[PDB]
Design a protein around this ligand. Structure first.
Ligand code: CAA
Ligand code: CAA
Lengths: 354, 354
């Protein structure tokens, strides 16, 4: 019922970015058919029909191509050359469907010296300067989960490519190939730091910048109960609101942006936040612009009033999952359909007329 | 010359996610016109025309509405109510252009108890469980820059909503409002962790999971020269390739997934990686499936062969910037146009026939 209602998508079962992009398309209403090798508990596989095919068999190849011939989009996330070998490369698909958006999701891209090399998120963000910039200054870099390569710089770019190529097709009548490399997407994702580096506004020193934890006003603080708050009071009026809530006299602290005295400033804020529990600070800063928020663990999220009231999550047999994002005022997305029994590929073809 | 050639976008100048979204649209060929308060060194404002208007004045409002009348998309990233008070709210824009995609970029969303509160990336990811999950276990949480709220779970969800709504418009003939809240987008961005929590595959203990640094085969290691490599060898055949490169006998190490002995395993891997410099390991693992990559600082990226060969970056002005992502085979994006001088708003209208 979302805005992608009517869109047909064939997804070749992979890991990480590919199934996440296919999930978001299905979340928004697309008709997504996932082909796996011959009832899932994986909530990521919500909003699909699952079928199976031996793509290396004559029958399996034939059936996939029939499906693809009726699709708008194809997603694959194998090594470059894998679909080519199978007879499912962009050139073969063009023969049956030149309107097809052929979406290729990789870490290293379709070509280049590392294009054939295995890897995972942490590898892709290692080569482009991102990982080096994450973590405390006095320790080795820490992975920001697989959030930056696989998803922000991976599936999200695949999604933009797919939907952009669909817009182009309104006018040209034709599809094309989208080459989404996580090493590329995540670089554009961090374009801000590349821009700042050029003007002296960001340095290559880990943990010593405005947004990486180096600034006392942009970091977490441990409270009296051992839980945490997040402070993000960058602008002077918000920072002042923060000091006001803590009851600290600005005249007695270092200037907010005197980096030479940041340790002094941080020590004073640390003592202040440590004096009470996390929930105390929620009360103190209620409806303020102080940019002070509780750092909630996953399992406490479903109790936060702002999360509850906006229905950011739903209960999926077992536990909470995120509702579709973003939101649409007229063609709103439905609550996701849970994973279901595998069905027969020929049933899908009858439906699709292929 | 990219896939979005022909698309008209009005951007109301803001910070963080909004300009990043508008940047990507411009990168991919969109005609983007940014209205600012009455030549930039900010590389992010690439691929724009900049104009100026006092939106609080009669004239400025009239001129903004004439421009918006001719647009496909409007991006705004102020607090809920701000454009409404201006006379630029969705209901006003709909009177002059019911095909307009009205894209609203915020942290907390358009409603709810936190909806009027100031904040930045760190606050948005503090409330939904994400920040709590980032960093070493023995320390307070560390922000993953502003990569996860502002961009992966922010601008990129704004982009997916804009382009999805443009798809829907093909059939309905109408636009609608896109409500992109960083608290929601970033939650869908981390859907994999919500799915895993339900099946016992992810815990709320920071630094103690497969992908957060807890696993010895998915983390960075410091080398003889104080520089780092990234290991990402999750799959057993990749892990074996890693140990082969290290010259370690698998028979003499704890099993890869015996978590009880992970400290022992990490101690042996630490001793191995510590015995030579980063670039030694870079060489040893340059071509294998071991998932071991050198961790490059921003300043080194431009020297990495895979980065060079694929033109992931271009030289803009005294610095590298990321080329457009993702890539398109038929309608490829141009090298970004640098920020140029402000132009007169009527010049844009003349051009757009406003
Ligand atoms: S999480 C992010 C991890 N990284 C990525 O996704 C980047 C892109 N992908 C890759 O680099 C790799 O797929 C990977 C490193 C993740 C895994 O590598 P891998 O396990 O060696 O798989 P890969 O090289 O992609 O090959 C997949 C094989 O399964 C086959 N396959 C896939 N679906 C199939 C089906 N339904 N029926 C039959 N075979 C199938 C393919 O034909 C291919 O076989 P070949 O090696 O003979 O050509
Ligand atoms: C920046 C980082 O490093 C990290 C980040 O996360 S950036 C993301 C920041 N968060 C967000 O963007 C969420 C949405 N926006 C906001 O919450 C807020 O804009 C903010 C907290 C960031 C800033 O707060 P603020 O400075 O009080 O701005 P805001 O409340 O949006 O109002 C902007 C005012 O400028 C005006 N304005 C904007 N463009 C104008 C123009 N061209 N002419 C005249 N007025 C203009 C408006 O009329 C509005 O005035 P009013 O208060 O009278 O209604």
């Amino acid at each position: 019922a979302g805005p992608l209602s009517g869109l047909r998508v064939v997804e070749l079962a992979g890991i990480g970015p590919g199934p996440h992009a296919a999930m978001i398309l299905g979340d928004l209403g697309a008709d997504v058919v996932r082909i796996d090798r011959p009832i899932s508990r994986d909530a990521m596989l919500r909003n699909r029909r699952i079928v199976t095919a031996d793509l290396k068999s004559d029958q399996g190849l034939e059936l996939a191509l029939k499906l693809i011939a009726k699709a708008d989009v194809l997603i694959e996330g194998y090594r470059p050359g894998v679909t080519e070998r199978l007879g499912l490369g962009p050139e073969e698909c063009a023969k049956v469907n030149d309107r097809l958006i052929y979406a290729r999701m990789t870490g290293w891209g379709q070509t280049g010296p590392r294009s054939q090399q295995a890897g995972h998120d942490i590898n892709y963000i290692s080569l482009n300067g991102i990982l080096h910039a994450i973590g405390r200054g006095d320790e080795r870099p820490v992975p920001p989960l697989n959030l930056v390569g696989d998803f922000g710089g991976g599936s999200m770019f695949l999604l933009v490519g797919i939907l952009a190529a669909l817009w182009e097709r309104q006018s040209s009548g034709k599809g094309q190939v989208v080459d989404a490399a996580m090493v590329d997407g995540s670089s554009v994702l961090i374009q801000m730091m590349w821009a700042m580096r050029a003007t002296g506004m960001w340095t290559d020193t880990r943990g010593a910048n405005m947004l990486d934890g180096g600034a006392p006003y942009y970091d977490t603080y441990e409270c009296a109960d051992g839980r945490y708050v997040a402070v993000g009071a960058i602008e002077p009026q918000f920072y002042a609101a923060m000091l006001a809530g803590l009851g600290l006299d600005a005249a007695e602290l270092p200037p907010q942006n005197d980096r030479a005295r940041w340790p002094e400033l941080r020590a004073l804020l640390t003592e202040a936040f440590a004096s009470h529990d996390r929930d105390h600070w929620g009360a103190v800063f209620a409806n303020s612009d102080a940019c002070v928020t509780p750092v909630l663990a996953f399992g406490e999220v479903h109790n936060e009033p702002h999360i509850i009231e906006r229905n950011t999550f739903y209960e999926a047999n077992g536990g909470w999952q995120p509702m579709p994002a973003p939101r649409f005022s007229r063609t709103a997305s439905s609550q996701p359909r849970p994973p279901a029994a595998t069905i027969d590929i020929e049933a899908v073809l009858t439906d699709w007329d292929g």
